[PDB]
Short mmCIF file of C-alpha atoms and ligand atoms in Angstrom, two decimals:
data_model
loop_
_atom_site.label_atom_id
_atom_site.label_comp_id
_atom_site.label_asym_id
_atom_site.label_seq_id
_atom_site.Cartn_x
_atom_site.Cartn_y
_atom_site.Cartn_z
CA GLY A 277 24.71 -8.06 -8.97
CA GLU A 278 22.99 -10.92 -11.42
CA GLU A 279 25.88 -13.20 -10.85
CA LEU A 280 23.47 -14.11 -7.65
CA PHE A 281 20.80 -15.47 -8.99
CA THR A 282 22.09 -17.78 -11.35
CA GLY A 283 20.58 -20.25 -9.17
CA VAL A 284 17.95 -21.60 -6.17
CA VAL A 285 18.55 -18.94 -3.71
CA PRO A 286 16.97 -19.25 -0.34
CA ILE A 287 14.97 -16.72 1.35
CA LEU A 288 13.80 -15.73 4.71
CA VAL A 289 10.73 -12.96 5.39
CA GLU A 290 10.21 -11.03 8.85
CA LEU A 291 7.16 -9.31 9.23
CA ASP A 292 6.00 -7.38 12.54
CA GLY A 293 2.71 -5.38 12.24
CA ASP A 294 -0.24 -3.61 13.95
CA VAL A 295 -3.04 -2.40 11.81
CA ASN A 296 -5.66 -0.60 13.91
CA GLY A 297 -4.05 -1.54 17.15
CA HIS A 298 -3.49 -5.67 16.53
CA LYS A 299 0.12 -6.42 16.96
CA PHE A 300 1.10 -9.62 15.17
CA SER A 301 4.52 -11.07 14.05
CA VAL A 302 4.75 -13.43 10.53
CA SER A 303 7.85 -15.45 9.68
CA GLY A 304 8.26 -16.80 6.13
CA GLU A 305 10.62 -19.12 4.10
CA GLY A 306 11.31 -20.73 1.13
CA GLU A 307 13.39 -20.14 -2.09
CA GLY A 308 13.51 -17.99 -5.06
CA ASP A 309 14.76 -19.07 -8.88
CA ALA A 310 15.32 -16.30 -11.26
CA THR A 311 16.00 -18.07 -13.87
CA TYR A 312 12.33 -19.49 -14.31
CA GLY A 313 11.15 -15.96 -12.24
CA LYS A 314 9.50 -18.37 -9.71
CA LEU A 315 8.87 -18.05 -6.02
CA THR A 316 7.81 -20.75 -3.31
CA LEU A 317 7.47 -19.22 0.07
CA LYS A 318 5.54 -20.59 3.16
CA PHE A 319 4.45 -17.68 5.98
CA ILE A 320 3.33 -18.31 9.55
CA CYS A 321 1.80 -15.71 11.75
CA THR A 322 3.90 -16.58 15.26
CA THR A 323 1.55 -14.68 17.91
CA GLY A 324 -1.67 -16.38 16.45
CA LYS A 325 -4.34 -15.29 14.27
CA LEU A 326 -3.46 -13.26 11.40
CA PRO A 327 -6.06 -10.02 12.10
CA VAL A 328 -6.27 -9.65 8.58
CA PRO A 329 -6.68 -11.87 5.41
CA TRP A 330 -3.56 -13.52 4.21
CA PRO A 331 -4.05 -12.56 0.82
CA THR A 332 -3.81 -8.93 1.77
CA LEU A 333 -0.19 -9.02 2.60
CA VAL A 334 1.02 -11.02 -0.63
CA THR A 335 2.40 -7.80 -2.24
CA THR A 336 4.08 -7.08 0.80
CA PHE A 337 5.66 -10.46 1.41
CA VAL A 338 10.90 -9.78 -3.25
CA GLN A 339 11.05 -8.30 -6.78
CA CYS A 340 14.37 -9.33 -7.61
CA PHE A 341 13.69 -13.12 -8.70
CA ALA A 342 11.52 -11.51 -11.57
CA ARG A 343 12.90 -13.42 -14.92
CA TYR A 344 14.46 -10.63 -17.45
CA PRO A 345 14.54 -11.91 -20.52
CA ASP A 346 18.36 -11.28 -21.98
CA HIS A 347 17.31 -8.05 -23.83
CA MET A 348 16.01 -6.35 -20.84
CA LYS A 349 18.71 -7.20 -18.09
CA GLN A 350 19.92 -3.83 -18.46
CA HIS A 351 16.51 -3.00 -16.70
CA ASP A 352 16.64 -5.01 -13.50
CA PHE A 353 17.16 -2.21 -11.35
CA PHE A 354 16.62 -5.28 -8.32
CA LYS A 355 19.32 -7.79 -9.05
CA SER A 356 21.59 -4.88 -9.93
CA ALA A 357 21.32 -3.43 -6.02
CA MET A 358 22.53 -6.21 -4.26
CA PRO A 359 23.74 -7.99 -2.27
CA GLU A 360 23.47 -5.30 0.06
CA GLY A 361 19.64 -4.96 -1.20
CA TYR A 362 17.18 -1.97 -0.96
CA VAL A 363 14.33 -0.16 0.75
CA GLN A 364 11.14 -0.91 -0.66
CA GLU A 365 8.46 1.35 0.62
CA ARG A 366 4.27 1.44 0.18
CA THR A 367 1.04 2.78 1.00
CA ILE A 368 -1.52 0.51 0.42
CA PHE A 369 -4.94 2.50 0.10
CA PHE A 370 -7.95 -0.41 -0.05
CA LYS A 371 -11.05 1.38 -1.31
CA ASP A 372 -13.39 2.51 0.63
CA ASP A 373 -11.25 1.43 4.08
CA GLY A 374 -8.29 1.07 5.37
CA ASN A 375 -4.81 1.65 4.68
CA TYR A 376 -1.41 -0.19 5.05
CA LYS A 377 2.26 1.34 5.19
CA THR A 378 5.44 -1.14 4.40
CA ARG A 379 9.28 -0.32 5.29
CA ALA A 380 11.02 -3.16 3.83
CA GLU A 381 14.85 -4.40 3.93
CA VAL A 382 15.39 -6.76 0.77
CA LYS A 383 19.44 -7.55 1.14
CA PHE A 384 21.70 -10.40 0.92
CA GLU A 385 22.69 -11.74 4.03
CA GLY A 386 25.29 -14.35 3.34
CA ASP A 387 23.81 -16.97 1.17
CA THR A 388 20.22 -15.88 2.08
CA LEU A 389 18.21 -13.53 0.71
CA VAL A 390 16.27 -11.39 3.71
CA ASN A 391 12.81 -9.28 3.76
CA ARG A 392 12.68 -7.73 7.12
CA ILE A 393 9.26 -5.64 7.35
CA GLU A 394 7.69 -3.03 9.29
CA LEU A 395 3.44 -2.44 8.80
CA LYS A 396 1.50 -0.44 9.91
CA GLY A 397 -2.43 -0.29 8.95
CA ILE A 398 -5.17 2.10 10.38
CA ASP A 399 -8.79 3.20 9.31
CA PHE A 400 -10.06 -0.07 8.86
CA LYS A 401 -13.46 -0.14 9.27
CA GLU A 402 -14.38 -2.86 11.74
CA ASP A 403 -17.24 -4.25 9.54
CA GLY A 404 -15.43 -4.07 6.30
CA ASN A 405 -14.34 -6.51 3.62
CA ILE A 406 -10.53 -7.03 5.47
CA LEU A 407 -11.39 -7.04 9.21
CA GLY A 408 -14.43 -9.13 8.35
CA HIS A 409 -12.15 -11.71 6.53
CA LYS A 410 -14.55 -11.57 3.82
CA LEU A 411 -11.66 -12.07 1.08
CA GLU A 412 -11.73 -14.99 -1.46
CA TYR A 413 -8.25 -16.96 -0.40
CA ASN A 414 -7.21 -16.72 -4.01
CA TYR A 415 -5.26 -14.10 -6.13
CA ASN A 416 -5.04 -12.56 -10.03
CA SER A 417 -2.67 -11.80 -12.32
CA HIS A 418 -1.46 -8.12 -12.35
CA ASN A 419 0.78 -6.19 -14.37
CA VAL A 420 2.83 -3.83 -12.30
CA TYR A 421 4.74 -0.76 -13.69
CA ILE A 422 7.81 0.01 -13.44
CA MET A 423 9.49 3.50 -13.51
CA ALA A 424 13.04 5.39 -12.79
CA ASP A 425 13.56 7.76 -10.62
CA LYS A 426 17.03 8.60 -11.22
CA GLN A 427 16.53 11.83 -8.74
CA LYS A 428 16.71 9.01 -5.54
CA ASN A 429 18.47 6.76 -7.48
CA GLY A 430 15.62 4.47 -7.70
CA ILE A 431 12.39 3.23 -8.86
CA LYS A 432 8.83 4.03 -8.62
CA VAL A 433 5.94 0.78 -8.93
CA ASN A 434 1.95 2.20 -8.82
CA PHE A 435 -0.30 -0.67 -9.72
CA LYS A 436 -3.55 -1.89 -8.42
CA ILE A 437 -4.45 -5.05 -6.93
CA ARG A 438 -8.04 -6.92 -7.46
CA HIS A 439 -8.95 -8.96 -3.91
CA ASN A 440 -11.75 -10.70 -5.27
CA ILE A 441 -14.55 -10.49 -2.58
CA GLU A 442 -17.14 -13.39 -0.95
CA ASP A 443 -20.07 -12.07 -3.16
CA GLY A 444 -19.03 -11.22 -6.73
CA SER A 445 -17.79 -8.64 -5.91
CA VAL A 446 -14.01 -7.17 -6.37
CA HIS A 447 -12.04 -4.73 -3.67
CA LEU A 448 -9.15 -2.49 -5.07
CA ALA A 449 -6.06 -2.06 -3.53
CA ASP A 450 -4.07 1.23 -4.76
CA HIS A 451 0.08 0.27 -4.28
CA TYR A 452 2.32 3.12 -4.40
CA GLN A 453 5.75 1.73 -3.97
CA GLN A 454 9.40 3.04 -4.13
CA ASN A 455 12.15 1.18 -3.97
CA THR A 456 16.08 3.04 -3.01
CA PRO A 457 19.60 1.14 -3.17
CA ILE A 458 21.00 0.10 0.38
CA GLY A 459 24.71 0.58 -1.01
CA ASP A 460 26.73 3.86 -2.34
CA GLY A 461 27.01 1.88 -5.30
CA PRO A 462 26.11 1.89 -8.70
CA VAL A 463 22.40 1.01 -9.84
CA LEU A 464 21.19 -0.21 -12.91
CA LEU A 465 17.83 2.35 -13.54
CA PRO A 466 15.02 1.26 -15.92
CA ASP A 467 13.41 2.54 -18.93
CA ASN A 468 9.42 2.05 -18.54
CA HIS A 469 8.37 -1.37 -18.44
CA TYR A 470 6.59 -4.40 -15.90
CA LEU A 471 6.64 -6.94 -14.73
CA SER A 472 3.56 -9.47 -15.05
CA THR A 473 2.79 -11.26 -11.81
CA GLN A 474 0.94 -14.73 -11.18
CA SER A 475 0.12 -15.46 -7.53
CA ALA A 476 -1.35 -19.20 -6.17
CA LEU A 477 -1.93 -19.27 -2.54
CA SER A 478 -2.41 -22.64 -0.98
CA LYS A 479 -2.51 -24.45 2.78
CA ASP A 480 0.15 -26.67 4.28
CA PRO A 481 -2.51 -29.83 5.06
CA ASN A 482 0.20 -30.59 7.66
CA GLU A 483 0.38 -27.06 9.18
CA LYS A 484 -1.60 -26.58 12.34
CA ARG A 485 -0.61 -22.50 12.89
CA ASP A 486 -2.35 -20.03 10.98
CA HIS A 487 -0.49 -19.78 7.53
CA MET A 488 -0.45 -19.31 4.00
CA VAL A 489 1.70 -20.84 0.91
CA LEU A 490 2.56 -18.27 -1.83
CA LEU A 491 3.72 -19.24 -5.07
CA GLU A 492 4.48 -16.32 -7.48
CA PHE A 493 5.49 -16.69 -10.98
CA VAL A 494 7.21 -13.13 -12.50
CA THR A 495 8.16 -12.11 -15.74
CA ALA A 496 9.41 -8.47 -17.23
CA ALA A 497 8.26 -7.30 -20.59
CA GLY A 498 8.19 -4.02 -22.50
CA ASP B 17 7.78 19.06 3.70
CA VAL B 18 4.52 20.16 2.52
CA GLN B 19 2.46 23.01 3.50
CA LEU B 20 -1.33 22.21 4.26
CA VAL B 21 -3.66 25.64 4.13
CA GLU B 22 -7.44 25.08 5.04
CA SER B 23 -10.46 26.88 4.45
CA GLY B 24 -13.90 27.16 4.51
CA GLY B 25 -15.49 25.96 8.00
CA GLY B 26 -17.91 27.43 10.15
CA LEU B 27 -21.84 27.81 10.48
CA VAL B 28 -24.38 25.63 8.71
CA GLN B 29 -27.60 25.01 9.00
CA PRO B 30 -29.66 21.45 9.25
CA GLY B 31 -30.25 20.03 5.86
CA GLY B 32 -27.48 22.99 4.30
CA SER B 33 -24.52 23.06 2.65
CA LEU B 34 -20.79 23.56 3.37
CA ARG B 35 -17.39 23.37 1.68
CA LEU B 36 -14.04 22.76 2.60
CA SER B 37 -11.05 23.61 0.50
CA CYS B 38 -7.40 22.57 0.50
CA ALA B 39 -4.17 23.89 -0.44
CA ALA B 40 -0.94 21.97 -0.57
CA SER B 41 2.56 23.71 -1.54
CA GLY B 42 6.50 22.22 -1.36
CA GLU B 43 7.19 18.74 -2.35
CA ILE B 44 4.42 17.96 -4.38
CA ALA B 45 5.50 15.17 -6.28
CA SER B 46 5.56 13.15 -3.47
CA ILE B 47 2.11 13.36 -2.64
CA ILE B 48 0.28 10.38 -3.80
CA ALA B 49 -3.40 10.76 -1.76
CA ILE B 50 -5.25 14.16 -0.59
CA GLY B 51 -8.41 14.20 1.78
CA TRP B 52 -9.78 14.83 4.95
CA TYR B 53 -10.26 13.45 8.48
CA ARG B 54 -12.82 14.72 11.09
CA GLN B 55 -12.88 14.44 14.83
CA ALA B 56 -16.16 14.85 16.42
CA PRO B 57 -16.88 15.48 20.63
CA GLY B 58 -15.94 12.80 22.33
CA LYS B 59 -14.70 10.73 19.41
CA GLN B 60 -11.68 9.40 17.90
CA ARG B 61 -9.98 11.00 14.45
CA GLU B 62 -11.89 8.86 11.52
CA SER B 63 -10.88 9.84 7.98
CA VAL B 64 -13.64 10.69 5.63
CA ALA B 65 -12.80 11.21 2.00
CA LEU B 66 -9.43 10.39 -0.09
CA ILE B 67 -8.31 11.13 -3.61
CA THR B 68 -5.30 9.04 -4.42
CA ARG B 69 -2.76 9.88 -7.42
CA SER B 70 -4.61 7.62 -9.62
CA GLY B 71 -7.66 9.14 -9.13
CA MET B 72 -9.33 6.58 -6.67
CA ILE B 73 -11.80 7.93 -4.39
CA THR B 74 -12.03 6.25 -0.53
CA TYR B 75 -14.55 7.58 1.43
CA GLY B 76 -15.09 6.91 5.56
CA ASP B 77 -18.18 5.82 7.01
CA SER B 78 -18.94 9.57 7.96
CA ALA B 79 -19.58 9.66 3.81
CA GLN B 80 -22.54 7.62 3.50
CA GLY B 81 -22.92 9.11 0.11
CA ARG B 82 -23.73 12.85 1.17
CA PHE B 83 -19.72 14.51 0.95
CA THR B 84 -18.26 14.32 -2.27
CA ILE B 85 -13.99 14.41 -2.94
CA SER B 86 -12.71 16.66 -5.77
CA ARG B 87 -9.01 17.27 -6.78
CA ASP B 88 -7.97 20.55 -9.07
CA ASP B 89 -4.51 18.80 -9.86
CA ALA B 90 -3.52 22.29 -11.82
CA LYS B 91 -3.87 25.06 -8.57
CA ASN B 92 -2.79 21.23 -6.45
CA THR B 93 -5.92 21.83 -3.95
CA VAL B 94 -8.54 19.25 -3.40
CA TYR B 95 -12.28 20.06 -2.10
CA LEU B 96 -14.76 18.63 0.33
CA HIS B 97 -18.75 19.30 -0.61
CA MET B 98 -20.31 18.25 2.20
CA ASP B 99 -24.62 18.57 1.82
CA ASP B 100 -27.54 17.37 3.87
CA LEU B 101 -25.96 17.85 6.60
CA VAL B 102 -26.71 17.14 10.71
CA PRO B 103 -26.17 17.94 14.06
CA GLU B 104 -24.09 14.78 14.48
CA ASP B 105 -21.39 16.40 11.44
CA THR B 106 -20.79 18.91 13.86
CA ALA B 107 -16.90 18.14 13.98
CA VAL B 108 -13.52 19.44 13.34
CA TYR B 109 -12.39 18.80 9.61
CA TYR B 110 -8.22 18.35 9.24
CA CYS B 111 -7.05 17.76 5.38
CA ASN B 112 -3.99 15.05 5.06
CA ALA B 113 -1.76 14.57 2.55
CA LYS B 114 0.20 11.30 2.10
CA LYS B 115 3.08 9.85 0.81
CA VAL B 116 4.69 6.66 0.56
CA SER B 117 6.89 6.78 3.61
CA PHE B 118 5.90 6.90 7.78
CA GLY B 119 4.45 9.97 8.39
CA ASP B 120 1.66 12.02 7.48
CA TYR B 121 0.87 16.15 6.86
CA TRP B 122 -1.60 17.63 8.35
CA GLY B 123 -3.42 21.11 8.33
CA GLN B 124 -4.54 23.15 10.92
CA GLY B 125 -7.88 21.98 11.11
CA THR B 126 -11.21 23.53 10.75
CA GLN B 127 -14.52 23.76 12.78
CA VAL B 128 -17.37 23.00 11.42
CA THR B 129 -20.83 23.14 13.07
CA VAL B 130 -24.08 22.69 12.21
CA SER B 131 -27.30 24.00 14.42
CA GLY B 132 -30.17 26.03 13.82
CL1 CL C 77 -7.24 -15.27 4.99
CL1 CL C 78 -14.28 4.24 9.97
NA1 NA C 79 -14.23 5.01 8.12
NA1 NA C 80 2.25 9.75 4.44
#
């Protein structure tokens, strides 16, 4: 289970979206190293221009690559569910604006870790910070709170993202998440703990298409 | 399954105030947000006010600081306080409850009419 994460793991991400009716597709690839807690990915909007700011999709775009220290390794649900994988589902409320709903299947297919995502956004304001692309191209660190959900054989997660806005203000994105195993086998249901997450966003100077380079560093504690 | 019961619609004069309430029953633990949408004549449904399990509050454009939403987590009821009402607030107000997965829960709808 955790044996699959002993070294570098290539990743594929596939997302199909519809936000306020604007359909779009994103494809991503890169690699993850759970030993370091390191994720390194590049995403391309394949249908043209992304109708939403890239930072709003960071959380949607593989927590099995979190580094769990040795004394916390029996609390790593994400790896224990591999390779058959897990369903990750979210609702994300952007304060005073729209909401996203996402369903993602994260599982090994061969040696590649794949994240396949369907995203539906509604209630966004035409002249608001998200459909107006008034979000800065950065991210902040956040703690993610992980609880067991023995009844569905998985975990529930709640956390709030602070997106920096181009005017100095901050826009909150309230995340509700649950993960349930795809496989019929047994998983690790953890005690309460959190993942400390850092994310850095950049651009490929040689990439002419609309895109985002994402680096994440993730570590468990508590 | 969860069930939503609405009450408190009706006739009101301009400048006056109204309250809507909505009680939810059944699988309460799955609800992450509850609140209200409205649909005015000839217009598409627009979100008005929600409050999430964490207590965060989110208003659509029709609020304009005139609508307030509160939640009685004990009696699993949500309330919409609407005041300084105008004729253009005339519409059908729908209670709405959200879960993490696709697909919402909706109430039957309640008419609100503002006129002299
Ligand atoms: Cl962007
Ligand atoms: Cl709107
Ligand atoms: Na709105
Ligand atoms: Na829902």
